[PDB]
């Protein structure tokens, strides 16, 4: 049974899963539009959106928390100088997930992840 439980497994250990989702978030913040599998895309929201929520307020402690979660100086800089001011007045929902068919190699369902106001 898994009554009222949250979180996914995706056939990985916990540390591998955490590292993978950190990599996905960094790639998303760099390119602003990515293609991945649908379960990964849906789980990525719960990891990526709170980073923007944190970056809305610019302090030393917030920057150090962002660096602890991302380990990417460029990602931290872009979060605190571009994305947070952009989404300062938006009440959540900074990403959109769109179904995009299946993948040729293994017939896996796929999705696009996009930032709300990309360009």
């Amino acid at each position: 049974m898994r009554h009222r439980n949250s979180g996914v497994k995706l056939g990985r250990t916990s540390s591998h899963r955490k590292a993978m989702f950190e990599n996905l978030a960094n790639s998303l913040f760099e390119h602003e539009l990515i293609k991945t599998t649908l379960p990964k895309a849906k789980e990525l929201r719960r990891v990526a959106e709170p980073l923007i929520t944190l970056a809305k307020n610019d302090t030393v402690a917030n920057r150090r928390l962002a660096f602890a979660r991302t380990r990417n100086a460029a990602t931290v800089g872009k979060l605190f100088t571009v994305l947070g001011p952009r989404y300062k007045e938006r009440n959540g929902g900074y990403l959109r997930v769109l179904k995009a068919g299946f993948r040729a190699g293994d017939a896996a369902p796929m999705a696009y992840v996009e930032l709300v106001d990309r360009e």
Partner: peptide, 17 residues
């Protein structure tokens, strides 16, 4: 197109990707 999916050329509900 497949229902609830982006088309092959990147259109969905008017917006283009």
């Amino acid at each position: 197109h497949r229902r609830h999916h982006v088309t092959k050329d990147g259109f969905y509900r008017g917006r283009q990707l």
